[PDB]
Amino acid sequence: RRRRIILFPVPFQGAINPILQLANVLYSKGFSITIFHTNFNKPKTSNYPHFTFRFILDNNLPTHGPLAGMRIPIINEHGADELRRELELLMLASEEDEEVSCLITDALWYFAQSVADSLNLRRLVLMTSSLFNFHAHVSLPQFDELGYLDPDDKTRLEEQASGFPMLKVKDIKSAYSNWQILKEILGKMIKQTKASSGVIWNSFKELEESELETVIREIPAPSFLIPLPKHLTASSSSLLDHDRTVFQWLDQQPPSSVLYVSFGSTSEVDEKDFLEIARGLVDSKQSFLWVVRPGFVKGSTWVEPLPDGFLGERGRIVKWVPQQEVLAHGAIGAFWTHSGWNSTLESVCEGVPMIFSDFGLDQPLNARYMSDVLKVGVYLENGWERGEIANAIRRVMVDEEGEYIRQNARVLKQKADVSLMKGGSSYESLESLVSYISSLLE
Numbered sequence: 378r379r380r381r382i383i384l385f386p387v388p389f390q391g392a393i394n395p396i397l398q399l400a401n402v403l404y405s406k407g408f409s410i411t412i413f414h415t416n417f418n419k420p421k422t423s424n425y426p427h428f429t430f431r432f433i434l435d436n437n438l439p440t441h442g443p444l445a446g447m448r449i450p451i452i453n454e455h456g457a458d459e460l461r462r463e464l465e466l467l468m469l470a471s472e473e474d475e476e477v478s479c480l481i482t483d484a485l486w487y488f489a490q491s492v493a494d495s496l497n498l499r500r501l502v503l504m505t506s507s508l509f510n511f512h513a514h515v516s517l518p519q520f521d522e523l524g525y526l527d528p529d530d531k532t533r534l535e536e537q538a539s540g541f542p543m544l545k546v547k548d549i550k551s552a553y554s555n556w557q558i559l560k561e562i563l564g565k566m567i568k569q570t571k572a573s574s575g576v577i578w579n580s581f582k583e584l585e586e587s588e589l590e591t592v593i594r595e596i597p598a599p600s601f602l603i604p605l606p607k608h609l610t611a612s613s614s615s616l617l618d619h620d621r622t623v624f625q626w627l628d629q630q631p632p633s634s635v636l637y638v639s640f641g642s643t644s645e646v647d648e649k650d651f652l653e654i655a656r657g658l659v660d661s662k663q664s665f666l667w668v669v670r671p672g673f674v675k676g677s678t679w680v681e682p683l684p685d686g687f688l689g690e691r692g693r694i695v696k697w698v699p700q701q702e703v704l705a706h707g708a709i710g711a712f713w714t715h716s717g718w719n720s721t722l723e724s725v726c727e728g729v730p731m732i733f734s735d736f737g738l739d740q741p742l743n744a745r746y747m748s749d750v751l752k753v754g755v756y757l758e759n760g761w762e763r764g765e766i767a768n769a770i771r772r773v774m775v776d777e778e779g780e781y782i783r784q785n786a787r788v789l790k791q792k793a794d795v796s797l798m799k800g801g802s803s804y805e806s807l808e809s810l811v812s813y814i815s816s817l818l819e
């Protein structure tokens with residue numbers, strides 16, 4: 378292959394997944410692929426015989442928990458010299474007829490821009506969160522001087538934000554609840570994304586059409602929107618063993634009778650709220666498949682606080698599944714999600730309507746957009762209460778009053794499918810991306 382692309386993900390599941398989906402999309406278009414990766418949380422290299430892996434940067438920190446994410450600031454602050462040596466030696470060791478076209482990194486690797494610059498290597502960024510999230514980010518000054526960033530101030534919560542009517546004030550509070558902490562790294566990510574040679578968004582035009590103008594205005598480099606879950610699932614980059622019972626169980630369930638439930642990799646709840654969630658599921662009387670990661674419940678290894686047989690025959694709790702493949706199964710009627718972007722987009726691409734909870738960061742923004750703009754789910758935006766949970770589940774899955782949500786999800790899946798076909802917005806965006814990358818050396 379004449380042209381090689383180097384991709385460098387952040388080593389967590391929700392960041393590895395889109396990068397390796399993109400790597401496959403680019404390999405399909407004729408590029409050779411080198412993955413730079415930490416030894417930490419490395420994927421199964423034997424699932425990618427067509428890729429070359431080069432392990433870097435970590436050849437005392439915990440492997441799990443919120444402290445695991447400390448690797449990202451540390452590598453941003455201390456990895457430049459090593460990344461440069463690794464990039465330069467690969468650039469030098471290339472075949473006579475081969476050329477390294479560009480580096481693609483997670484936007485969170487803001488340190489890679491100066492490194493790539495110093496080698497005259499173009500860097501493109503893969504955004505793993507939405508255009509709407511970015512639009513909210515760049516509106517933070519206007520939020521600030523309206524005081525919305527004031528955790529000890531608790532007013533106008535249910536009001537729409539002025540100048541940003543798609544959001545409520547509480548959404549902004551929740552999303553930027555750690556602002557004073559994160560404003561530094563957030564600012565660096567945005568700066569070095571704007572300074573990049575191109576931004577790839579895991580999205581599609583018909584999903585976030587209200588946001589395109591913002592990214593054209595705010596980012597000089599070209600933007601490309603590609604809905605990676607419509608190209609392929611992320612099953613090959615799973616860091617955990619998929620549960621081997623769920624599909625046999627799903628085959629025993631009537632169509633659209635199952636609520637899939639997963640609250641995310643790092644989310645955490647009190648025992649009180651955990652039990653209230655369980656009560657709401659039982660009260661809904663719907664069948665459910667619930668992925669609970671060990672540690673989800675404060676103070677318990679897994680799901681100890683659940684009483685024996687409390688979930689009855691209608692429910693299953695597992696630790697890990699191939700999520701997009703589950704969402705594609707005919708038994709699934711709805712998805713109760715924490716509103717992480719991969720999960721939300723997977724559900725959209727499989728046409729599954731959603732019930733939304735959130736645990737901060739971009740999740741409240743995703744829930745608000747999907748529930749109020751697209752109207753493909755119900756946002757539980759006032760905590761955990763068994764009656765409200767049961768009503769939301771049933772509205773999406775059973776009630777005739779929720780038909781519009783179910784139909785809106787079906788229509789949006791069809792729009793994603795159309796965007797991939799020749800002539801569609803995603804197809805042409807990918808065509809532009811391939812031509813752009815191919816042009817970078819001339």
Ligand SMILES: O=c1ccn([C@@H]2O[C@H](COP(=O)(O)OP(=O)(O)O)[C@@H](O)[C@H]2O)c(=O)[nH]1
Pocket residue numbers: 390391392394611615639641642643668696697698699700701716717718719720721723
């Ligand atoms: O049992 C599970 C739970 C999650 N996922 C995948 O893990 C990723 C989770 O990313 P997301 O952005 O939704 O949220 P996070 O867990 O990073 O907060 C998605 O690709 C899911 O399909 C999976 O394959 N199986």
